[PDB]
Design a protein around this nucleic acid. Sequence first.
RNA 1: CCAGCAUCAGUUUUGGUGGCAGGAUAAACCCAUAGGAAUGUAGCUUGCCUCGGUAAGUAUUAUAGCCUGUGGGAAUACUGC
RNA 2: GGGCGAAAGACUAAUCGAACCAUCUAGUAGCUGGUUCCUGCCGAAGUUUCCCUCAGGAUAGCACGAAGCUCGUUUUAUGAG
RNA 3: UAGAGUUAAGGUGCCGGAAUACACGCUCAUCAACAAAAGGUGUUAGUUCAUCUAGACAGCCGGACGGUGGCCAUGGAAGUCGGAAUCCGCUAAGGAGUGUGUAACAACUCACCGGCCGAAUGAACUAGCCCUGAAAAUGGAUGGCGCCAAGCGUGUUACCUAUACUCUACCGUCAGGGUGCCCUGACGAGUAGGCAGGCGUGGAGGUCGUGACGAAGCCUGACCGUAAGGUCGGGUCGAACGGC
RNA 4: UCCCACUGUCCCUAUCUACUAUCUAGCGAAACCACAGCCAAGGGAACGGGCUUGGCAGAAUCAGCGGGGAAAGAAGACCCU
RNA 5: UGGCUUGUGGCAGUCAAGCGUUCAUAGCGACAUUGCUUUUUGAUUCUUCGAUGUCGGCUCUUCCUAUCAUACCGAAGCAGAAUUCGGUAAGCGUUGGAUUGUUCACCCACUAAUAGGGAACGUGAGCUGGGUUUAGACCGUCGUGAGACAGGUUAGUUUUACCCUACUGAUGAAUGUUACCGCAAUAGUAAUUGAACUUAGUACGAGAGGAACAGUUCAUUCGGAUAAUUGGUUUUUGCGGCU
Lengths: 178, 362, 165
Amino acid sequence: VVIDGKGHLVGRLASVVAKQLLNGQKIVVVRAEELNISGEFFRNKLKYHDFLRKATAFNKTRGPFHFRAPSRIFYKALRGMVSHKTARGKAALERLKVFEGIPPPYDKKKRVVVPQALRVLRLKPGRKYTTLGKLSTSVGWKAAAAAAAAAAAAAAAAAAAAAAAAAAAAAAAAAAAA
Amino acid sequence: KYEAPRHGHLGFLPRKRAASIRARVKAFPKDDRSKPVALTSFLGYKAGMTTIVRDLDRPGSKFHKREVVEAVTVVDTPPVVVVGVVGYVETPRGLRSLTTVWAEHLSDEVKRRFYKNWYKSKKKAFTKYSAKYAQDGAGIERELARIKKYASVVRVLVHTQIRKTPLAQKKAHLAEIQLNGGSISEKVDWAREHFEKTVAVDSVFEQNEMIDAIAVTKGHGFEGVTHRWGTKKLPRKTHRGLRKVACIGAWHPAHVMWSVARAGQRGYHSRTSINHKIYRVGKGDDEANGATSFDRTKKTITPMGGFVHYGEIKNDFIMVKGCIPGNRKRIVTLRKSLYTNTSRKALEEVSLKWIDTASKFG
Amino acid sequence: RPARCYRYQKNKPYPKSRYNRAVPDSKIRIYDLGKKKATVDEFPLCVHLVSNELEQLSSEALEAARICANKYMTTVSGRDAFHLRVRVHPFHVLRINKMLSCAGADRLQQGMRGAWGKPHGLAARVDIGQIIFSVRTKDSNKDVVVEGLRRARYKFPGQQKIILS
RNA sequence: CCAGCAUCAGUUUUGGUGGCAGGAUAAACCCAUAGGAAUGUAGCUUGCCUCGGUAAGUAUUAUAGCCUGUGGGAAUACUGC
RNA sequence: GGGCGAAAGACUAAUCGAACCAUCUAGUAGCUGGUUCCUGCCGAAGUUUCCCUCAGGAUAGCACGAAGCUCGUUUUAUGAG
RNA sequence: UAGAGUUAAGGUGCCGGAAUACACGCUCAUCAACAAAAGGUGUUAGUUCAUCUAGACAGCCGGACGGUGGCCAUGGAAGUCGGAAUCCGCUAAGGAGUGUGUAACAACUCACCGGCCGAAUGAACUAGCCCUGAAAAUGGAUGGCGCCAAGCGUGUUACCUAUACUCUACCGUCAGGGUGCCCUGACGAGUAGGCAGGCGUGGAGGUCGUGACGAAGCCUGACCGUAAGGUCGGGUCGAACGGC
RNA sequence: UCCCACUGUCCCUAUCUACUAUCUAGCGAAACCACAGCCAAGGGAACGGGCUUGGCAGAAUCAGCGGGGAAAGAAGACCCU
RNA sequence: UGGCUUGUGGCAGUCAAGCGUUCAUAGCGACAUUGCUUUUUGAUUCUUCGAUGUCGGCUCUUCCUAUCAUACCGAAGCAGAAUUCGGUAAGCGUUGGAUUGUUCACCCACUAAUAGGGAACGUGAGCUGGGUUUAGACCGUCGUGAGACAGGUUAGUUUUACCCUACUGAUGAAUGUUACCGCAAUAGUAAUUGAACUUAGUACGAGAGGAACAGUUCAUUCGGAUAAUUGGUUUUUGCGGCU
């Protein structure tokens, strides 16, 4: 089942995705960088899972491999839920691939239709909190056009809907004018 | 789990053989955003050196503008011939073209080369040397290539012309070479006049920039820890441990990483040396050498005699103050420098005062 | 042994004049201080530094708190309007082990066998309800011992609860 | 031949839903009437300062607390159907 | 237990501080190790008086096996911190 | 020894089955995840009291007076050292003084107190959430993803939950009533150890029965069910071996 | 030990040479037989590739080199009966 | 030996009265304690006899900062400058000799100057075997004695080819094929300081003295590049002497 990882928290999306992947259902998450992890920029700085001290230079020869990009976070994160250990686990992992950007131009389950939780309201809650598409910058994340442009790609998808789309709309409108 | 200090360079790992005789360099020196059309690298052959008796570049020196003895590799640069200017653009996958624009007439040494006719290796299929391919219709649509918006750095597949340098073979040495220039549009437009047949030497190399001296070095031996890293001997020098070393691993943990002081291949990659400052360019015959003394040996530019193991130079050379890898006979690939450190000392020529000419030997 | 390690007591009592092969010397200089005379006479106010705990206040720290407060209470007067006491004594002789060592020693000195804590120190017991540093101090104006009970409980292990008496 | 498991028709045991009732009791989802204590909102009038409001009268516009007297309501802990 | 010494028990068929070969001899080991069907009935103990006595064992504590038979819940007091 | 019927100890955002639930609340720091002496304008509540239109309190704004250098420590002491008297003054305020300053004068500021303003402010005392005190070496290293509620208290509700609990039957020895044995009580995790019962080889008093028209054996298949291992059947043998 | 001349031991390493390694033919050893072969954190017969979670780990093949597992081996050298 | 505690104790917070010109904290600190901690220095037979081989150094294979020096900042009872003290912050640099087995102990010549802690202190199938578990012989000291000693001296065994893994080089094969090479989603890397020309005789001062800040060059040292004017080797190929 195709969802969209856009404008809410990261963990309270990851959890919901795991129970859906469980059997073998082919859930792909689209966008990782427009999620939101919490923490400061002080404690959540030095020991953080991009490049600063820990999880980039975090390897041996026969040993780990992490990331320094806001795209690769959600991919690594959902081995860290559904492990490679069990047979269904490694099978369920392959049912998920995460994408940067929004390559589908169409509107699937995205903003209005999504599961519960997700879109937390910060009022009395929340002074400090990060964003994955801020945190990964001076970590080796460049090349914004390449990844950031993806937004530009998602735009052309919208465009395809808005067409023909625009046509059936103009019609639908004339229908009610009547 | 201790450490002893860094004797030798760690990051030449793995110490892989540079199979192809010409050096390659994935991270090319980026654009001359000044010169409207250039190339990124060029071509050379390692020949020999002379002592350039000149005067200093640094003008405020204590002994400013004195006599200065200096090294110089006088490498022969015959110009390269184009097969086709490949119009690399983008697609939404990646770095993918659309068409190339061929040259009509190639060289002569295209006979034997375009194949992979060697034992225990793959072929190619029957993509031999050129018939008369896409250039007529292809030349106009490289204008439309920048109109895509999906557009990248346009490059050009080249081959050498050999015998002209004293090496007599007529099977050419291949490489692609990137076109540089002002913008993406300019390295396409002015490169249309490049694919005609042969390019210029002077487009990439302006006199008195810097030139980074990458080439293919010699494979020394299966060099042990003494020469390959830089361990000593033990002064007792008996038993087993003469030219050996101590620690490779560590107790806790048993599993270490790729720092360890073992034996294997030394040199022989496409290893890059930094900003060797270009002296002069001379087209024909200018400087000479040959002096009857011990200095360093066996590479003599127009003495009484010639060079040993090369042949006597009657071509078109570029003079790099410094050096470039290989030894005699070896074909080199001179890349240009992206970060040019010092100010360009061009316009006028650099001084040649006097130089010797005699035998090199007795 | 700091006074962190002179806190509690699995050291059980042992304190009589009949049955003892001689105690060591103590530090203790004086009991009542400031006024000798006035207990509750001039002083209807007191603060007791009442123990929460059942500790041994060792004779090391016992003199310490008392002598800090001795030197302090000279500025106001060397017989000002307080009455800092010592109460419960080192009756019990504090048994402390070592020189000890099992094998590979002079004569062998044991520890386990040779369980007798060979008498080194002296300590008082200052159990629940009990105090040493009773400070009968004056009604109006110059009360000085509220301050001087930070300086009392510092040179004392444990967390004593300050009660107005 | 024991356990899983067996056509087709009728019935027990145990618990609940839903409808209804007894023990035993009357608060309520919300139930009358008379006299006395109380004091909230709308509208009007009068007084005083100021451009914005406030005090007093208002049982004589409309409505109430809490007690006393009289009269009338009242499905459920448990237990069964 | 002799041969032998300026000494080192060096020396004597690779064995010499008592040569080697064969027999009595399968000497002996208070100590250690190894050790062959199944189910059912049914199944404890690591405690003691005591020892020229200590990785043991006479006796006692506790349940083996077999035949014949065997509680207490709690009420009145009495003795002792 | 097995499937149901019911639930403990304890769980429900997710790896990995079950609330992204309901009601009220401090707090949102990722608190949750050690630590004392000793300490704090985060932030909330209760109780008592100074204080208040009899003009609370802050800021801004003043009067800094006459006696007078009051008196006295002392080499000197000066409001401005130590110690006591404790006022007058002008009776809508200035004490014989809140703080600074020079050996000190020389110089300066002000609670006390004055003048604008006009409403709830402030000390204690008690309780809670926070907050300060807290350093060490292989790759997250006080959770993987991470959570600001998916934290926690208090009150409530729904879902999940031990061969026990529990239904009924079946397996083991033995008792009683009455043989043949059946009804049927109480218990049945298990090592030493004893008893009972069952399967076991070589051999044999016995020995007839089976055999060359095909014996033991070799090899292979079928192959009852209490753990023990044995009968039948097929290809084949060329003399051996069991009823009782 | 001082003193005189001095020294590849070292500073300072380079170069050339003999023989082999690489590679090949033939015949043909040696004591020699654990399922298995990642690392960081955690529990623990107490310092785990092997067990709990998480990160990581493909096969055909040869030349190399001294860090672990702890090799080639004898029932430890300390230590007590 | 490993575990445990921190005994014996180290460090800091710090009760802060004293005493330094006045003056609890420029500084010095009676009297000592609380938390942390594992270094002086050891309490304990918990866990170990079909191996639990020692010290100082050579050589080569890590991580942290309880911080010597390099970047950045602030304060004094500090006149510039000498002197005195504290915070942000681990990428890099951190000498040469003599006494002594020897770091300890203890001294000198410089130099920009010569840190702290753990990691089976990489660490005897790489290495020395001076330091470090037996066996010639002697003295002191003790016992009737053979002989002994919490005292010293003289000579006196480092064997061999890494099974599996760490692991450094070189080849062979997987979405038609494919000689030839560019993106940078990622992996490995490189590193320092002084003097001199010169700033400036300027700031500021009693006197010795002489700051901010520029432009310019180069010397120690490392790696990669290194084959000409250097220094040498070159059995290949030629030249001198003796039986």
